[PDB]
Design a protein around this ligand. Structure first.
Ligand SMILES: CO[C@H]1O[C@H](CO)[C@@H](O)[C@H](O)[C@@H]1O
Ligand SMILES: [Mg+2]
Ligand SMILES: [Mg+2]
Ligand SMILES: [Mg+2]
Ligand SMILES: [Mg+2]
Length: 238
């Protein structure tokens, strides 16, 4: 128990059917942290589905998923749920659940993810934009990487803090928090990583790229609602 979010297993369902993915929490006070859900279609970026306050059962969705996904919580068990209705081939993705803290309003803990396959086969406006540049970054190891992230609006908050974070997602893995609030390294994150920038400009730099660092980097803003993610920047070797 060190903060674990264990989601239910793979799903193969029939179109028009419903599924109900689960996220069992442990290692922390379930009721003291907001649970947020994310959708990631193959090769696509992260889509905020919506979040729930396990404490009240209060929710807020991404206009896009409202009426489609239903978030619930079972306090007596520290398990949060997301139900999907009228399933479509388009809902075939990998869904994640993640805890969002308050001090940095970043997603510090993610579940392993739940792959959903919708099929009849029986075996397998005003939202803030985040633009990541470049799309892909080929390097030779020991090389220095420098990724940039730009938002359509300033990300400074009334409190004087800027909620821009960097997540890293290694192949087949769940994304993970690297840097929160522009330049703070998350726990266990090496010093070769270092964020910077202000208002609308932000850059992630990796002085020395290493095999453990390859994967896709996502910046995300949360000083505005909804929460948005950059398209992602893939770091791979030549
Ligand atoms: C939910 O509490 C958070 O509200 C907004 C996001 O909605 C954040 O930017 C702010 O810093 C607070 O930590
Ligand atoms: Mg709503
Ligand atoms: Mg509202
Ligand atoms: Mg503060
Ligand atoms: Mg204030």
């Amino acid at each position: 128990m060190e903060i674990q979010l264990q989601q239910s297993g793979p799903e193969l369902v029939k179109p028009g059917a419903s599924v109900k993915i689960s996220c069992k929490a442990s290692g922390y006070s379930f009721t003291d942290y907001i649970m947020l859900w994310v959708k990631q279609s193959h090769g696509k970026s992260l889509e905020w589905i919506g979040n729930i306050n396990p404490y009240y059962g209060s929710t807020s969705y991404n206009l896009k998923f409202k009426g489609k996904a239903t978030l619930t919580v079972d306090k007596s068990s520290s398990t949060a749920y997301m139900q999907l209705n009228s399933l479509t081939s388009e809902d075939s993705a990998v869904y994640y659940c993640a805890r969002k803290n308050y001090y940095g309003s970043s997603l510090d803990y993610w579940g392993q993810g739940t792959t959903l396959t919708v099929s009849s086969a029986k075996t397998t406006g005003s939202d803030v934009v985040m633009t990541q540049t470049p799309f892909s970054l080929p390097v030779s190891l020991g090389d220095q990487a420098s990724i940039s992230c730009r938002s359509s609006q300033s990300l400074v908050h009334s409190n004087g803090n800027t909620y821009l974070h960097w997540y890293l997602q290694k192949p087949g893995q769940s994304p993970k928090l690297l840097i929160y609030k522009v330049s703070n390294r998350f726990s266990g994150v090496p010093d070769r990583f270092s964020g910077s920038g202000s208002g609308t400009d932000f850059t992630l730099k990796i002085s020395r790229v290493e095999a453990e660092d390859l994967g896709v980097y996502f910046c995300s803003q949360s000083t505005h609602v909804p929460y948005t993610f950059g398209g992602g920047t893939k770091l791979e070797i030549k």
